Amino acid sequence: MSFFDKVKGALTSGREELTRQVGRYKNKKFMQGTVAVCARIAVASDGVSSEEKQKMIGFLRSSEELKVFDTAEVIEFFNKLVTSFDFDLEIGKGETMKYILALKDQPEAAQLALRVGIAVAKSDGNFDDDEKSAVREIARSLGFDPAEFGLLE
């Protein structure tokens, strides 16, 4: 009872019900995490992920759910994971999970989504290299460590 859900952008009231209730669960990976994995295998694209989507589940633990209300922000993560995962299964959920938590602005987390764009042509060949100069502007634009990641784990 937790797999593909023709979500493509729309799921159970989990957005307003599971996030607003988060004020007593803190476990975002529980419902929303089991959801991300629903996408990792439904990517329908031609690559699939596993270690990348799992990483996103951790983001859920820190997802925007921190507020415990913006239901539109919750579906924002699964909605993008289900519809956006048809290209960069591993890279798609890797940066997207960033704009949900980051959001501090909007174009910074999306900027990474742009290099991921090169992955659209390289769903598994490019990306993970600009993330270094990107975190520099991301950590500063949002407020994290001024450059110091570069995925490539």
Identify whether the C-beta of residue 91 lies closer than 8 Å to the C-beta of residue 116.
Answer: yes
Measure the CA dihedral 33/38/39/43, to 10°: 150
- Check: CB of residue 109 under 8 Å from CB of residue 99: yes
Method: NMR
Q: How many CA atoms lie within 13 A of 69 on its CB side?
A: 1
- CA 22/CA 60 separation, integer angstroms: 11
Neighbours of 30 (CB within 10 A): 17
Q: Which two tokens stand for residue 121?
A: 């042509």
Contacts of 77 (CB under 8 A, 6+ apart): 32, 36, 56, 59, 60, 63, 64, 96, 97, 100
Q: For residue 15, which amino acid is it?
A: R
Q: How far apart are CA 32 and CA 66, in angstroms?
A: 13
Whose tokens are 């490019």? That residue is 126
d(Cα 13, Cα 23) in Å, to the nearest integer? 16
Fold of 1-153: TerB-like (1.10.3680)
Nearest CA-CA partner of 89 in 29, 37, 134, 24: 37
Q: What value, to the nearest 5°, has the Cα angle with vertex 111 and ends 105 and 116? A: 140
* Domain extent listing, the chain: 1-153
Rounded to 10°, the helix 71-84/89-101 angle is: 170
